[PDB]
Amino acid sequence: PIVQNLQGQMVHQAISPRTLNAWVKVVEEKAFSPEVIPMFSALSEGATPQDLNTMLNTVGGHQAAMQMLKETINEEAAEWDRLHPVHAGPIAPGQMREPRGSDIAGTTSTLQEQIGWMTHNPPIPVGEIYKRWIILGLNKIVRMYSPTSILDIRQGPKEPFRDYVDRFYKTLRAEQASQEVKNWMTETLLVQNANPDCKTILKALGPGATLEEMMTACQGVGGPGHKARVL
Amino acid sequence: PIVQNLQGQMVHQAISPRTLNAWVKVVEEKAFSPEVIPMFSALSEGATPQDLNTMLNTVGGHQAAMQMLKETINEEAAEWDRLHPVHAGPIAPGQMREPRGSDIAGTTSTLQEQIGWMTHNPPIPVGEIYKRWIILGLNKIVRMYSPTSILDIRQGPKEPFRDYVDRFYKTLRAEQASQEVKNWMTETLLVQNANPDCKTILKALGPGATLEEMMTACQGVGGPGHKARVL
Amino acid sequence: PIVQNLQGQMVHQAISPRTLNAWVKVVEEKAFSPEVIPMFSALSEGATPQDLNTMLNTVGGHQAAMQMLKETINEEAAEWDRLHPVHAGPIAPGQMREPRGSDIAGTTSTLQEQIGWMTHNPPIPVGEIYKRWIILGLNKIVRMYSPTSILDIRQGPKEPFRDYVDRFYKTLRAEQASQEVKNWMTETLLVQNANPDCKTILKALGPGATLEEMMTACQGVGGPGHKARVL
Amino acid sequence: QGPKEPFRDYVDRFYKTLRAEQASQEVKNWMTETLLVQNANPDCKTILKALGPGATLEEMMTACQGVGGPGHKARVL
Amino acid sequence: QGPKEPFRDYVDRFYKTLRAEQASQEVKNWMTETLLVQNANPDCKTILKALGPGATLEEMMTACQGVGGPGHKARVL
Structure with missing residues (x-):
């Protein structure tokens, strides 16, 4: 050239x-x-x-x-x-x-x-x-x-957070949508397709999380998730 | 660039x-x-x-x-x-x-x-x-x-010091902590995480000694430590 | 005043x-x-x-x-x-x-x-x-x-499309979101939360159908869009 | 708050009663903060203390709406 | 800390032990951060984990003071 x-x-x-x-x-x-x-x-x-x-x-x-x-x-x-x-x-x-x-x-x-x-x-x-x-x-x-479509990315019983997050990042480039809308969507979707065991600990991290905070939580052994408190 | x-x-x-x-x-x-x-x-x-x-x-x-x-x-x-x-x-x-x-x-x-x-x-x-x-x-x-975290790495029963030290220094490189703390911690951490065969040999060299001096002695003894003093 | x-x-x-x-x-x-x-x-x-x-x-x-x-x-x-x-x-x-x-x-x-x-x-x-x-x-x-949340409204087996879309519109009253975000989010929910047999009709209809077009098709298939002598 | 009573019935009585309180507002505000934890039932009381010091009525309501009430929630028929 | 051992009793033995150590101010502090989290009893530990990184000893103690005993179960039914 x-x-x-x-x-x-x-x-x-x-x-x-x-x-x-x-x-x-x-x-x-x-x-x-x-x-x-x-x-x-x-x-x-x-x-x-x-x-x-x-x-x-x-x-x-x-x-x-x-x-x-x-x-x-x-x-x-x-x-x-x-x-x-x-x-x-x-x-x-x-x-x-x-x-x-x-x-x-x-x-x-x-x-x-x-x-x-x-x-x-x-x-x-x-x-x-x-x-x-x-x-x-x-x-x-x-x-x-x-x-895989965005809804196809899922986590079964024995799968760790690492693989689940990796498949979302792999499929991310095929999403081709507005970045502000995509960010807003992404946090809803992570909770939605998670394993019941994983969903409880992910909901224990709760609203207002960043990728680093989520990754920090995902690096542990699985902190408190809490079942049966009112039972 | x-x-x-x-x-x-x-x-x-x-x-x-x-x-x-x-x-x-x-x-x-x-x-x-x-x-x-x-x-x-x-x-x-x-x-x-x-x-x-x-x-x-x-x-x-x-x-x-x-x-x-x-x-x-x-x-x-x-x-x-x-x-x-x-x-x-x-x-x-x-x-x-x-x-x-x-x-x-x-x-x-x-x-x-x-x-x-x-x-x-x-x-x-x-x-x-x-x-x-x-x-x-x-x-x-x-x-x-x-x-593995610092207290998660403990030497196996038939494991020799060689493989344990290889894991420890590799783990230490990812810790991201002060050099003073790392140097000062190393002295007691190796003794406390060693198995009984290794620890018996390791304490024989005793106080003061630097890594070169300890390593030179360890290389001579070799293996997963030879049998003690009561048989 | x-x-x-x-x-x-x-x-x-x-x-x-x-x-x-x-x-x-x-x-x-x-x-x-x-x-x-x-x-x-x-x-x-x-x-x-x-x-x-x-x-x-x-x-x-x-x-x-x-x-x-x-x-x-x-x-x-x-x-x-x-x-x-x-x-x-x-x-x-x-x-x-x-x-x-x-x-x-x-x-x-x-x-x-x-x-x-x-x-x-x-x-x-x-x-x-x-x-x-x-x-x-x-x-x-x-x-x-x-x-109830937008993801929580899911069509049952014996739940009509009209009951499902009426419930969907009702939970959409409380959606609390930006105009840009809701116009992208709403699209996937309609087939995502529909019952398996109802999804078949929606899948067949495919992308390119606006709300008037989709409602017209649903009105035309009757009830939850059943599979018994309506063709 | 009753043993099988949801948070909503309890807070409704507390706020209904509060309307007729007739006292200095700054004095009331101190008392009102304590009363929410004090009169709650053992099972539902825990969440108020969990959010800890310096929480607003709105912050408390968000946790309280999630909890709902005592024991397990009913089945169809 | 054992499952039948309250927080004050656990704190008391730690400070008694700490005085005999003879160590530098930074090191004791920097070990205190991880030690409390690591050696707390399972039931008691969750309250500490929930509070997480940040704050100071009085703020942490204030949270502990409210739950009492060995991570005690306030709920009775």
């Missing part, structure tokens, strides 16, 4: 073979797992759209998800060609020619044209826009392959 | 994939082991909160523990926003307006914004402070995974 | 004995009912503190709830005095003097001066805030009243 500045104006270089080995390895070990999403954001420096497409094009096994992601990207591209302040008719000499929806992606764009609007005059955030569409599509994929 | 000196002014680069692969692989094996805390201290060169945020997000197995660390960062940021430099608020043009307690973490602060104040003005400790918070969180995480 | 405009300057006028009897009748038959809050809101014309205080003081049966509500007014008044515009005592001669939080109370300010500072010079919302604080006390009374 694009690199260098302090040592002189940016050059658009070839993608790393080491990063390609890592991308293939990460997919082979954990294809549908959430940690791929921040990893993709981390190594996508310079974010040239043409290079970003190569990561999507080189996928083996779960190619169907990548094709669905491409259909989703094309839907987002269509919005950029309508809803947003897209250019009307003629364009003057020397100009980079303000991107259309399909010009964002490599299928109908030439590499020098793409680099041209990324740094010839004021930069267009095409790499960030294309990358954002990919993250939005990846968020749709993790809830398309999720085995 | 911000790196470069001999070739000129520092540049904000991205995390190494070799380091990311190593960080994932070490956590796959040594998930809660104490040496992770020095490794994280060594993997945070040129410390930048934006890059550090990603390292916590790419975690596999212990996402639940990581959310408690994230909550700890929110509490420390809140403490920073209240009991440390709050900041005036309104400020004249030609200034970078400084980081608020929330802005130390990449949640309310954007990429270039953090780099700008660390580069345009003398070093801002935001990376150092965020790193210190992560180390505090990791210390709390090992505590929340601990299995 | 103070009334009149079309005939000229405003005047203080007495409440109807029928209005007082209507309130007393509501207290006798439905004291803790959630329908009391809009009924009280409908009957509480104007907002002058002395006449508002009469409504609270004429209650019979639930004296403790009224005492707790009265304490809640004091709690809000204290917050209003010190966390909202406190203002300051010295002001030039010929003013009506801006009320403090303790002056809002019926036991503190006299009727002649109380109406006098509420309309001689541009209005002060002294009554408006008192009515607002009464609603907070009523929200607390709904919590004390609460006999």
Whole structure:
């Protein structure tokens, strides 16, 4: 992708073979797992759209998800060609020619044209826009392959608090809902699917708990839960 | 992270994939082991909160523990926003307006914004402070995974001192207590938690003696202690 | 209450004995009912503190709830005095003097001066805030009243859908939540708390059905949505 | 409070009686705090003491509403 | 503390023992925090656990004073 500045104006270089080995390895070990999403954001420096497409094009096994992601990207591209302040008719000499929806992606764009609007005059955030569409599509994929729904996460008689909490955190990324609402929901749900034995001690911790306080309580041997006081 | 000196002014680069692969692989094996805390201290060169945020997000197995660390960062940021430099608020043009307690973490602060104040003005400790918070969180995480407390570890009947000492020092590394208390406690704690065969040999060396002197004698006697003085 | 405009300057006028009897009748038959809050809101014309205080003081049966509500007014008044515009005592001669939080109370300010500072010079919302604080006390009374929770309303085998949804709407009167939160929470409950055979119909109907659409289907399947010759 | 009497009937009588008390308010407030623990039945009294010193009527009510009354709560038919 | 042993009797033996130890002010305090929680009788211990971290000795003693005996059962029926 694009690199260098302090040592002189940016050059658009070839993608790393080491990063390609890592991308293939990460997919082979954990294809549908959430940690791929921040990893993709981390190594996508310079974010040239043409290079970003190569990561999507080189996928083996779960190619169907990548094709669905491409259909989703094309839907987002269509919005950029309508809803947003897209250019009307003629364009003057020397100009980079303000991107259309399909010009964002490599299928109908030439590499020098793409680099041209990324740094010839004021930069267009095409790499960030294309990358954002990919993250939005990846968020749709993790809830398309999720085995357990939020109500499916439960704790049987012999299960400890550790596993019960871990499965909620694993399924958390597939929830895709408003954060303030999600927080409010999460505290109700923990009490709800707990084992009767566990529910009594968890209700003994009572209202107004934080994750750290809950984890602190969960680290013990099981403090007082109280049965039969009025009996 | 911000790196470069001999070739000129520092540049904000991205995390190494070799380091990311190593960080994932070490956590796959040594998930809660104490040496992770020095490794994280060594993997945070040129410390930048934006890059550090990603390292916590790419975690596999212990996402639940990581959310408690994230909550700890929110509490420390809140403490920073209240009991440390709050900041005036309104400020004249030609200034970078400084980081608020929330802005130390990449949640309310954007990429270039953090780099700008660390580069345009003398070093801002935001990376150092965020790193210190992560180390505090990791210390709390090992505590929340601990299995045996100080009086829970008592030597077995046929167990030798070797295996007991191995467990004791590993347990001690996760305690998070004063060095004076730890040194002073060790002298009576080993004698009081030892089995009868071990304790008989252990008291033979007697008062004053340092760990090297005791260990040298113990290595010679070996095993789970040889039989006493009445048979 | 103070009334009149079309005939000229405003005047203080007495409440109807029928209005007082209507309130007393509501207290006798439905004291803790959630329908009391809009009924009280409908009957509480104007907002002058002395006449508002009469409504609270004429209650019979639930004296403790009224005492707790009265304490809640004091709690809000204290917050209003010190966390909202406190203002300051010295002001030039010929003013009506801006009320403090303790002056809002019926036991503190006299009727002649109380109406006098509420309309001689541009209005002060002294009554408006008192009515607002009464609603907070009523929200607390709904919590004390609460006999069943939203998760506790579960359809039996021989319990009709109409009885179940009527019970669900009744416990929703006491839900006490934000507009954003309840619009997300309510959606899952309808199939979650429905009986197994009733769930089959709801599952078949699927996501995309609003309340009018869902009610139309339920009206069409009869009773709890049974499985005997209704197809 | 009776041996099989719920908290609600007991607090209702206490507050009904309180209306006709006729004494200085600050003096009453001290007495009123003590009376709640004093006249409660052994089984229901425990929760008032459990919340300890400096609790409000609202804080007490929340615990009291959860407890309800003596023994076990009835069955259908 | 045994199940038939009240809190004052348990406290008395601890202080008598503590005077003979001859130790630094921080260490005695820092051991006192965990010792009371660890060696209290099971019935009595719950009251201490319910109070939990924080406060001072008079506040803890005030809570204990109200329940009496060896974590005594105030309830009789």
